[PDB]
């Protein structure tokens, strides 16, 4: 990993010295740098050994001498394919932008502000202080991606009181991170694993992490930032948001909640149970109220992510496997649906949803692919999302199956409204006022669709290569939770 | 795929030896998977019993299948 780690930063910076009004070169070379960092992510996958509690390719550089809070970079188990999904998806955003001129949307600026692999950092960052810096850090890139080239639906903004609470929750986690950091000098995640805290304080520290996380996670009391953040997000800002920025909260719980505070997690199991359950119920019923397509997909994403939560709780190896594989399948499916709804916007240039009609005439291949992914967002058994969600379900393994009975409503209403909305979008010869402008999909368009469908099917028919490469790590996490 | 059953030196109180405490985790989970795969091998052997009989295909192994199941306890 030593050299092949910093591909996106090197690429971005050495392209910053190429303003190059003639876009062809910046597009080509940024895309090549992204694709080669993805290639090195994938060869790093191939490099994996599914047999160690240690982290696969550890590296560091002194960051502050005393207590050495340094860039500790591990990729065991989950992070392995989290960074893989990150890379998998970043060329997708670079490729959804072969727009010809791309002038006001200055192409090199979006290249340089999507080609920041701080997501790679955080998923490999294995000392929760610097790990803290990155999800909060990616907000500066996310904010510029969300509105600079993002569609303007309102005076671009986020609920100000909610945003203040969201960042306050993030900084509340920071106080908890410091309390553990000075609690026993424990710099990094290996030693924060080894150490043992006061049960009276483990619960406080757990909920303090949980503040920021359950903001990043879309739980019922605070999740509103996803719809408002997406309906304004650009086509490639949503692909990243759904893809990774939601995985942030669940991976945070996975690494720095379950094997960190085993007693606090034991104590708060019913809390997250009910939270995620009622969140899934709400976000299943809501798309009744929401007619906005981006809000629809964002709420389906909330549902899936709170399923990821209702599964990560468990010492069930199947439980957390279903959690992380619902994460992978979600970063595939919701991002593929955001790709879909972005194509559906642009090809129609309209931001009402009642206006997407006669799709089987305009773009019938888009109808086929939109089904190929909406069956997934409802988790058709056979798809990747099915393996994910059902290992989430069997996560009631040592349990007594009372939260699966709330996932009942959460997923039945989800699949129901998934089908309702796929109909509502493709229904009828509802002639729109587009002046016979059909907008058939592009070869590059079906290309950027290719990898999501491929990952989806390759998981849904063969989840081994992902459950393997993971079981050793998750099982170590579980025994530390034992 | 070459590990050792001894976990070095870990007493019951595990705060003392973080090296040995991590090693007990990493190889007692190896033992966890030992007996999990033992249950899985005995399950493939339950399928093997069924394959063999084909006419009883419940009996002549069912109490031995209960022995198989005794790899798991506390069913309540």
């Amino acid at each position: 990993l030593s050299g092949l780690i910093l591909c996106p930063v090197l690429g971005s910076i050495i392209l910053l010295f190429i303003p190059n009004s003639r876009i062809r070169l910046i597009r080509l070379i940024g895309l090549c740098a992204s694709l080669i960092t993805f290639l090195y992510s994938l060869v790093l996958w191939i490099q994996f050994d599914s047999s160690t509690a240690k982290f696969q390719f550890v590296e560091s550089l002194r960051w502050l001498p005393y207590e050495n809070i340094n860039f500790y970079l591990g990729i065991d188990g989950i992070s392995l394919f989290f960074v893989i999904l990150t890379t998998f998806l970043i060329p997708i955003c670079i490729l959804v932008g072969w727009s010809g001129m791309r002038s006001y949307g200055k192409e090199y600026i979006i290249a340089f502000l999507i080609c920041e692999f701080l997501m790679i950092a955080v998923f490999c960052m294995l000392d929760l202080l610097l790990f803290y810096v990155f999800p909060e850090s990616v907000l500066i890139p996310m904010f510029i991606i969300i509105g600079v080239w993002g569609s303007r639906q309102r005076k671009i903004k986020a609920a100000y009181q909610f945003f203040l609470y969201t960042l306050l929750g993030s900084l509340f986690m920071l106080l908890a991170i410091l309390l553990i950091l000075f609690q026993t000098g424990t710099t990094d995640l290996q030693i924060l694993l080894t150490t043992e805290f006061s049960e009276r304080r483990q619960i406080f520290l757990w909920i303090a992490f949980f503040a920021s996380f359950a903001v990043k996670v879309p739980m019922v009391p605070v999740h509103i930032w996803l719809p408002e953040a997406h309906v304004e997000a650009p086509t490639a800002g949503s692909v990243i948001l759904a893809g990774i920025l939601l995985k942030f909260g669940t991976y945070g719980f996975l690494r720095f909640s379950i094997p960190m505070f085993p007693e606090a997690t034991l104590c708060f199991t019913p809390f997250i149970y009910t939270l995620s359950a009622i969140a899934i119920i709400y976000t299943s019923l809501t798309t009744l109220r929401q007619i906005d397509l981006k809000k629809i997909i964002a709420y389906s994403s909330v549902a899936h992510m709170n399923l990821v939560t209702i599964g990560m709780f468990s010492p069930n190896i199947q439980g957390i496997g279903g959690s992380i594989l619902l994460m992978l399948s979600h970063g595939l499916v919701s991002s593929a649906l955001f790709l879909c709804v972005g194509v559906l916007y642009d090809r129609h240039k309209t931001r009402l949803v009642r206006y997407y009609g006669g799709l089987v005439s305009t773009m019938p291949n888009f109808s086929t692919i939109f089904f190929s992914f909406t069956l997934a967002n409802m988790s058709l058994p056979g798809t990747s999302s099915f393996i994910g969600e059902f290992l989430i379900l069997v996560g009631a393994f040592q349990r007594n199956s009372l939260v699966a009975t709330l996932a009942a409503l959460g997923m039945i209403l989800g699949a129901a409204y998934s089908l309702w909305l796929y109909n509502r979008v493709v229904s009828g010869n509802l002639k729109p006022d587009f002046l016979h402008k059909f907008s058939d999909l592009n070869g590059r368009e079906v290309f950027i669709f290719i990898p999501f469908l491929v990952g989806l099917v390759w998981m849904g028919v063969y989840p081994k290569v992902f459950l393997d490469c993971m079981h050793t790590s998750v099982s170590n996490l579980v025994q530390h939770g034992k | 795929f070459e590990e050792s059953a001894p976990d070095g030196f870990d007493p019951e109180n595990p705060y003392k030896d973080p090296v040995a405490m991590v090693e007990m985790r990493e190889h007692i989970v190896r033992e966890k998977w030992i007996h999990i795969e033992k249950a899985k091998i005995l399950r493939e052997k339950v399928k093997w019993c069924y394959r063999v009989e084909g006419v009883n295909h419940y009996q002549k192994c069912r109490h031995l299948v209960q022995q198989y199941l005794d790899a798991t306890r506390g069913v309540g």
Partner: peptide, 23 residues
């Protein structure tokens, strides 16, 4: 009704607790 689900959710939590008391 919303507060009803909020309290019945922790009631299902308590049902898990009663199952824990079953053994």
């Amino acid at each position: 009704g919303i507060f009803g689900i909020a309290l019945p959710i922790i009631v299902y939590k308590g049902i898990v607790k009663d199952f824990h008391m079953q053994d």
